[PDB]
Amino acid sequence: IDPFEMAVKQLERAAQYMDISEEALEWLKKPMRIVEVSVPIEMDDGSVKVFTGFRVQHNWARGPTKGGIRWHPAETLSTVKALATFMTWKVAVVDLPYGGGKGGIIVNPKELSEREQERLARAYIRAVYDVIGPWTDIPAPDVYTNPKIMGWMMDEYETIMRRKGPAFGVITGKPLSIGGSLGRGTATAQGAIFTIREAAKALGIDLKGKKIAVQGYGNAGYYTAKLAKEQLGMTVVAVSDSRGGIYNPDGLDPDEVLKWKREHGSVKDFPGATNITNEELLELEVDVLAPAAIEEVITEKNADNIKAKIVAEVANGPVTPEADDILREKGILQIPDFLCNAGGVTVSYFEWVQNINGYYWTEEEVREKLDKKMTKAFWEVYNTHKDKNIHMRDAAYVVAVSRVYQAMKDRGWVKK
Numbered sequence: 517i518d519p520f521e522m523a524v525k526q527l528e529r530a531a532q533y534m535d536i537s538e539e540a541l542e543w544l545k546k547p548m549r550i551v552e553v554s555v556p557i558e559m560d561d562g563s564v565k566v567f568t569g570f571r572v573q574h575n576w577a578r579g580p581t582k583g584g585i586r587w588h589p590a591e592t593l594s595t596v597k598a599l600a601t602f603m604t605w606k607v608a609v610v611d612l613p614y615g616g617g618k619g620g621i622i623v624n625p626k627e628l629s630e631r632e633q634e635r636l637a638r639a640y641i642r643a644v645y646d647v648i649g650p651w652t653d654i655p656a657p658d659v660y661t662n663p664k665i666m667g668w669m670m671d672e673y674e675t676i677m678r679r680k681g682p683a684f685g686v687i688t689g690k691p692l693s694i695g696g697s698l699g700r701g702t703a704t705a706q707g708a709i710f711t712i713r714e715a716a717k718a719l720g721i722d723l724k725g726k727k728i729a730v731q732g733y734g735n736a737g738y739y740t741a742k743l744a745k746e747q748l749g750m751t752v753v754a755v756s757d758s759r760g761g762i763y764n765p766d767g768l769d770p771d772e773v774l775k776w777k778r779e780h781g782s783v784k785d786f787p788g789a790t791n792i793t794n795e796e797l798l799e800l801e802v803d804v805l806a807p808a809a810i811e812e813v814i815t816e817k818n819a820d821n822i823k824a825k826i827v828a829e830v831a832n833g834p835v836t837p838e839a840d841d842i843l844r845e846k847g848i849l850q851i852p853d854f855l856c857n858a859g860g861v862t863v864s865y866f867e868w869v870q871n872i873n874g875y876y877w878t879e880e881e882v883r884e885k886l887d888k889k890m891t892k893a894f895w896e897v898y899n900t901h902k903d904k905n906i907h908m909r910d911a912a913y914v915v916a917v918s919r920v921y922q923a924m925k926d927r928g929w930v931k932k
């Protein structure tokens with residue numbers, strides 16, 4: 517059903533466990549500003565083709581909006597609005613001076629060439645310039661969008677702004693050569709590792725030598741497994757993909773698996789492991805489950821088959837609302853998605869701070885700062901969950917919407 521309707525219904529259901537006025541809830545139920553523009557480019561055949569681009573600024577009570585740009589052929593305004601609403605909560609839960617935003621272009625980047633991609637990025641910036649800025653709206657990379665497009669977009673924005681302010685801060689996730697940050701590439705997996713470490717500390721289970729399964733061997737999933745094996749002392753026994761999955765009782769080395777992904781199709785047919793499917797990995801005996809794949813994979817059909825003490829939501833929406841209650845009844849600690857993968861937006865915030873200050877940090881400073889914010893965020897959510905006897909998703913929503921509501925009351929946007 518409609519993504520924005522799902523997000524609004526989730527917020528309504530989470531509003532039951534916290535004191536919020538009706539006017540503020542109605543304010544939060546709709547985005548503050550929605551921009552739909554035409555994005556024309558010159559194709560390699562010389563013809564001009566016009567694309568539809570979106571930019572949604574859900575709420576800027578706590579600061580400038582922040583969200584990625586999507587280049588997907590199945591992108592709609594409703595999906596962008598839903599993701600912007602989720603970005604608002606994501607930046608509110610980790611205490612960032614940001615609001616929630618999102619953008620997108622209905623396009624297939626595979627069919628476009630390199631020059632067409634650069635033209636598309638520059639035209640999107642020229643179209644949405646009036647509503648974006650370093651203190652207004654900071655975009656970021658997302659699906660089918662990379663630091664190269666970030667660099668093109670930053671260059672176009674700087675060309676339009678005539679270098680009259682900090683142009684590097686208009687967009688994050690850009691190359692290190694031009695205003696990039698250290699630790700951006702592994703930000704979300706590092707944040708997820710921090711939240712998993714805190715969840716284990718809060719459960720009383722020692723994670724060294726414990727089984728972990730990660731679904732989806734993408735950028736987030738591979739690094740989640742690699743850091744789980746490296747700094748958490750986990751044991752990656754199973755990983756999965758879009759074609760299938762592999763499983764090994766002794767465990768797998770993330771470097772080899774990623775090496776294999778480069779020579780053969782996906783992760784299927786690992787030499788020493790067993791070829792399994794995605795549902796099999798979901799209902800597999802591991803200590804921590806990390807579904808970093810597409811959304812809606814843990815559902816009512818397989819909710820009661822889950823046997824993982826910790827379900828880390830690296831992806832956006834990997835667990836359905838009824839699966840949340842089923843897992844809570846089963847006594848499984850569930851880390852909400854907009855809290856678990858908040859490391860990416862936190863490191864993007866660090867990059868923005870470095871851009872606006874003109875001074876840049878090292879790897880260690882970024883890592884320690886990210887560790888502190890994710891630890892504080894997880895502890896706030898878990899304390900809210902314990903003091904009120906609610907699902908962890910409800911506690912995270914309470915924590916985020918409380919900050920947003922407080923900012924709205926301070927600004928005088930809403931009174932009661």
Ligand SMILES: N[C@@H](CCC(=O)O)C(=O)O
Nearest residue numbers: 582583584656860861864
């Ligand atoms: N949490 C964001 C990261 C991009 C950003 O820095 O806003 C996302 O992946 O949607």
